[PDB]
Amino acid sequence: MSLLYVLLIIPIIGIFLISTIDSFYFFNVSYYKKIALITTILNLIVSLIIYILFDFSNNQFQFIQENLDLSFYDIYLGVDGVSIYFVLLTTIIMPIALVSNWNSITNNIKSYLIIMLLLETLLLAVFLVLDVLLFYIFFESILPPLFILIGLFGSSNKVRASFYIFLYTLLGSLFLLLSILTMSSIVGTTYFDVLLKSSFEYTTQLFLFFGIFIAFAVKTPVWGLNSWLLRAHVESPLGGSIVLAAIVLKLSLYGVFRLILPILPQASLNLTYIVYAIGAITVLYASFSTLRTVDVKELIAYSSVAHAAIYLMGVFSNTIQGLEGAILLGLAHGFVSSGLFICAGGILYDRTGTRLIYFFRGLTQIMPLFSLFFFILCLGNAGTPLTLNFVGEFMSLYGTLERLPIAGMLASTSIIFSAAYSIYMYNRIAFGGSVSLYFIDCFRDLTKREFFILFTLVSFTVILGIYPSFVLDGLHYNISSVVYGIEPNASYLT
Amino acid sequence: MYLSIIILPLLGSVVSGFFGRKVGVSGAQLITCSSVIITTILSIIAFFEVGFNNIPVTINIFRWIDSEWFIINWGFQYDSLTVSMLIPVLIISSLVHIYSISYMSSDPHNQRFFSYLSLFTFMMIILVTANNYLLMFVGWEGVGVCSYLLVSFWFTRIAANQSSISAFLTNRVGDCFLTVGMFAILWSLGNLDYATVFSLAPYINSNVVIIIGICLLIGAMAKSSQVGLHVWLPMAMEGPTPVSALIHAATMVTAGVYLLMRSSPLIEYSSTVLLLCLWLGAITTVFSSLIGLFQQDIKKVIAYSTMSQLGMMVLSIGLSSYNIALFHLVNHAFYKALLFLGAGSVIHAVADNQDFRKFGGLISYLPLTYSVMLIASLSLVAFPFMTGFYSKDFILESAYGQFSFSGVAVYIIATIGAIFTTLYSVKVLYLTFLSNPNGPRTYYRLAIDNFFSAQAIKSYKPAHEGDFFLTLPLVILALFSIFFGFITKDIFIGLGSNFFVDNSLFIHPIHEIMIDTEFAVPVLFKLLPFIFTISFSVIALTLSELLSELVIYFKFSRFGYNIFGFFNQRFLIEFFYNKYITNLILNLGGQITKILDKGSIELFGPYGLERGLVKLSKNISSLSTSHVTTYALYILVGFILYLIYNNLLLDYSYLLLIIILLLLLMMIGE
Amino acid sequence: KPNITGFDMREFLRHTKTPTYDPWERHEAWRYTGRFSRFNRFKGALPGFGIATVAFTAYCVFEH
Amino acid sequence: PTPESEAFLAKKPQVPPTFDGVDYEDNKRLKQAQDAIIREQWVQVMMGRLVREELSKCYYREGVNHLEKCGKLRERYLQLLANAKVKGYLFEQQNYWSKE
Amino acid sequence: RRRPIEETLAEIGEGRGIKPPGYYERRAQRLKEKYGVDINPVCADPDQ
Amino acid sequence: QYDPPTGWLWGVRPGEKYQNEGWEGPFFYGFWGSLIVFAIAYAYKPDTSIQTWALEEARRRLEAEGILEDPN
Amino acid sequence: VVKLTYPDRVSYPREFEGGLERELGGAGAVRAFLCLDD
Amino acid sequence: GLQHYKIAMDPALVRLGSMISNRYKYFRWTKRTALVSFMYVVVVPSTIGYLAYKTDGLWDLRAKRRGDLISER
Amino acid sequence: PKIPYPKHVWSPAGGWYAQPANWKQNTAIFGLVIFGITAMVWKYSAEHEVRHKMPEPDRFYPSRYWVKQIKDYERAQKEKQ
């Protein structure tokens, strides 16, 4: 069997073991948690084995298994240098997601672990499948377990929040389905190798673009459309919020390198000015309203909207630099947003039971270790050099500017306004007076669990910010096949 | 060695910051101080090694960003301009650490303070030793973080929090423009290594230099607090005094100027950027000389005096005489840091009070401070044969030397800046030392006269001078403030000197003014600042002491009540920015949050659709009555419409109008 | 017309001088007398000037 | 010249970087065409990297005299900077263009 | 799968990174007709 | 005079010790240990970057010209 | 007021032999003064 | 879930948050709200889009030297 | 007067007024680990610094004592006649 199926089967084996141990024993919930965490370690172990054996400049799909037994819907699993790092991020994030929420679930612990083990399978799949109809199948199988992850383990406004993400993500995904169905009917299949050969007529590509973009604007999400995220990324449990922002948000970032860039190039080129206008607006309106947010977890959720706009504008630049910067900023947001939900929804909400920023002040005086990590995370969210977030923004903004110079200049306002929301939140909670008077008793500082998941996540952000070539070497050759263009003395050689 | 200069300040910071528990307060102080001391000798050596032998040093360690055409190395280049910058940076860092062993002695948190000091030194080293513009930007941002961490060191003071947000976001404004300008260089030349940018600049499209130059100018003035983005330098005086000495008035403000001296082999190829730098420099010298004359705080005056000298240096850059501004830059860090350290001593000697109105006498109590501070004021005003005379007054005469209108205008303008500089420097030395005592009596009670009987052992506090760690810097910094101008005036000014012959400071032969400034200027304008300084000084002393009634007639005239409050309020700039710019953004954010996100976006969307559809379906289900008689009529009605539709050959659109019109009537109740 | 308050600027400014009689005269006597007299006030405004001036004249006569 | 490394044989294109006379339903030939265009564009941009590295040394070697001694390197680097960009193959795969 | 280069150019247009063979000589003409300036870039090399 | 150093690290009061919750076991040996073993192995992984390949050829093309010196 | 009364230049632009055209980047570069108008 | 530490929950601030979370239930279409809802959603993005349309491929700084023009069209 | 502070707070930089008794031993140990890291960085520079100009045989230039590129030049230059 292929080694890419081993990534899928392990979480499946782990769900089986959680449901069949109580039959060998009133077993403790501690042993439920250990099995799920070990089984996400193994996926990470395997995924690094896949990465050692990867070939950084091969234009054929790798780790493929020859099926030669065709059906109507067959799983085809290939790994490519444009998808490898999305897989690695998934497998590094899911253990922290489990450890972060280790004592906070308290009830329905089996069901909680079985959903996350299910989620890791489906999100691993969406990066590994070699069809665009297969891509859609897994891109939307994550929807039922997320409706239940929010309504069982979510906060007060959990019911409306779970309806919002499900219904918005269902609606937006059904316009992508109509366009995928058109592509398949014209071409006969949705297997990548046969689609990338095929070139659609301009008018068809103009109508496939309207349909793949409706979906991804719903799933970025852009400003006019993000009302599900400000509910779902907040009412959800801590572990739900980590997966939703780090991994689920990137399903459409990686889905533009497959669905738009190679098969609808003329449409992408001629409509970019519409994308850039939308992207510029969500860099401003989201930045303006991230200043006035009184919910700490909601402030982090709103930050993701402004970040996602920068990478969306990068993936539409037709430049090798904005394309790699978009993947780097997708990865960068993955580690940093994870840490700030760990700070907001998993530490202050553990100790105070509230998310209102009015009750917090001067937390440096009694939690110095929280303050140190909270400040480093806050500076990466502000796009400060030495973090992977700065590199992703620099390259994303450069390509946005080289393609359409006016929108990149309005996108670069982020540099100013991301810094203004990030420092203002940090100053209000850690600094900004003395330990607040609403704290009747003292609050303990970080536990050894809270320290080491923040430390792990922060370490990824810095070392990748110093040596981004750890991720750039795989991207260069594979990214070099989604650029559309020619130069006069370099093309059509004889 | 060269890569060891970079690493030592970094290593000491790590021990003091994440290991302050293990070494303690004294252990941190020794390691932080000694490690920075060692780096300073290594850089004194590097000055003779690189500059005095014309041997630039290159090192490259590994890649930072490796995309096609974009390869930025974690690399360093030591040249003539580099080693000039390090000497003030490393000495002033070395001495301010030693100063701080006694200034912060009572503070609870010394391991954190001394760590931030080492961290700040590392970032200036990175800023002036990078190969490319992008690694320059690591220190540029790094010193920005270090400034925020030190203006907000006492994070329990809300005032300190406000001033650190102001330092951060005003500097992040120039960061946006500096990044935009850095995107122009990559777009135009593919790379942003210094060697590439300068080897290629003479042939680049003139209009592209005017894009890069105006971006590197807007970013530079944010850090150098020029007339527009300067609001933060005054507010930085919230952080402790030794931070103001190193970061806010001797090293960080310099990064704005260093960007232009470094980018000289490029921005000489645009007369626009040079004629823009010229005026931006001249406006700030007068803009900040008037404000400082009207402040009641020692540090707000000395901060506004820093701003005036910075405006002089950018004046020199626009004048295209880069080596002159590199001279004023190195010189200023000596007599400026001396004032803060000197004025730091007077604040500590009393009660940590800072107001001029409550300081007086204190010349006898603080004998060393007054002399050293007057050592500094004599060079700050560029009294003849001081370290300032060989730099500050050469810009004035080289301004008139460039026989153009703009040159003459900025001479006149900067000359007025000089006269108001001499004026507030009298205000500092007279009020604090030479004035009638103005503060409380405990500042002054000695032990000679016996004012006590049963408590004579304690309760005097007669404003004592500081200890060894406080005075040894001041005396050393003062020894610089005297001899340093004359000793290096050939390295930098000369007449045909070849120190910067590695193209570190490229001057285009179509701009040079040294020969004219040496010979063309008449003796009157060559000497004029000396006359004004010697004239208004005795006038100012006379008004402040001999005739102490004229100023109050001015303050209590209505005409003077308004001119006074216009300058004390800093040209009302803060008032206008805070009300029109800052508070506009907060209300825009509120309008988007309330009216749209929680409003029309939800009314024209999920909440509107929810409200409409539920009403729609309640009405339709009000039809279903379980009356067979009514159901039969509905089936016949639905039968007739089918026959009408598919026998009249009605337009399909006619049907949808009916269907859509029906749905709306079910939306309406009653 | 004068205000209902008797205050006026002209009389306010004219009184801006050392009062002849003061109920606080003794309490404030210290700030202007003794160590704080004008001679001692500016006795040391130029610390090294006296020592240097005589020393420099020694240098001048040394050449001749 | 520099001996061709052993690692420089498994990745050396065997085909001219074109699509003329390339059957698209033959996947191996089509993929090798694609790979052959990608590597030419990449060698061209790495040729600029190396000339720029020489220019840098010439700049620091000559100092003030860089404006006269490094112009041949300047000329080569400025030619590669407009001739070479990595533009991909997708345009060339989907369009046929001829000299006529 | 492939189209005549002229066909694609009509919908998207030459430019925006689509520089078909001969774009510079045509651009020379386009700029001369509009701005009225002869294009003559500098050699940027003191010898030949 | 300086005070003694203090503090409950992980909130552990000076009497007792940190009680292991469960995560510590696999997170320290499996999670981190996998990254050290990954880092150790990543050193010996061959370099299949497009640049290492494009540099070797592009050097040989420049070597034909006077731009780069040829050892032979 | 400065514009109304400010001095004329007193020094002629310094003549360089050949314009130093070879020391500033060839003909494709800005060269110093050489037997031109004033 | 877990019991949190004791907080002097402010009756005033709790109802302020309860006001914000429930705010959208009371939004109405007035002449004022339409004006803001029209400027932010239509005018400002339409204005940005128009500039993005008219400047597309208008300028390129790549390799351009003196004697050449930044404008590409 | 020293500020009152809570004694349960753990901080990597000491917190309030924190000096251990054994601080001289801890400080000394940190000095060597610094001095060892700096020594590795110095041997790196010596072998990777790049100069295009070479120092004169007689003028003060202590880099001639540790940098390979220079030292190899003067060793080669110490071979003539």
Ligand SMILES: CCCCCCCCCCCCO[C@@H]1O[C@H](CO)[C@@H](O[C@H]2O[C@H](CO)[C@@H](O)[C@H](O)[C@H]2O)[C@H](O)[C@H]1O
């Ligand atoms: C497409 C469908 C949607 C996709 C998402 C699927 C989500 C599946 C959730 C996991 C399956 C159900 O999870 C199930 O939860 C019930 C809750 O009563 C648990 O049942 C147990 O709960 C607690 C646990 O302490 C016991 O005290 C109780 O006696 C027992 O009923 C089961 O042990 C667990 O297996």
Ligand SMILES: CCCCCCCCCCCCO[C@@H]1O[C@H](CO)[C@@H](O[C@H]2O[C@H](CO)[C@@H](O)[C@H](O)[C@H]2O)[C@H](O)[C@H]1O
């Ligand atoms: C482009 C437009 C957007 C596309 C589609 C978006 C549709 C999302 C709208 C879903 C509306 C919310 O859906 C509905 O919300 C209410 C709460 O408000 C929920 O109601 C629930 O929450 C309330 C909270 O007091 C409780 O009484 C109880 O838990 C339950 O009744 C309903 O279970 C759900 O049916």
Ligand SMILES: CCCCCCCCCCCCO[C@@H]1O[C@H](CO)[C@@H](O[C@H]2O[C@H](CO)[C@@H](O)[C@H](O)[C@H]2O)[C@H](O)[C@H]1O
């Ligand atoms: C950035 C733009 C985002 C667009 C998202 C997608 C929009 C979806 C289109 C339909 C949305 C629903 O549109 C909404 O319809 C409902 C009825 O159902 C109206 O709801 C209300 O109408 C009027 C007020 O106008 C009320 O008196 C009435 O009681 C109520 O039904 C809203 O006024 C209308 O705005």
Ligand SMILES: CCCCCCCCCCCCO[C@@H]1O[C@H](CO)[C@@H](O[C@H]2O[C@H](CO)[C@@H](O)[C@H](O)[C@H]2O)[C@H](O)[C@H]1O
């Ligand atoms: C960081 C991104 C940078 C790229 C985006 C901005 C690029 C701006 C480029 C502006 C210059 C482009 O090219 C420029 O076109 C403008 C058009 O008015 C011309 O500008 C000139 O036009 C007319 C003639 O028509 C002149 O009389 C007038 O003095 C001047 O405005 C310049 O002579 C030419 O050099």
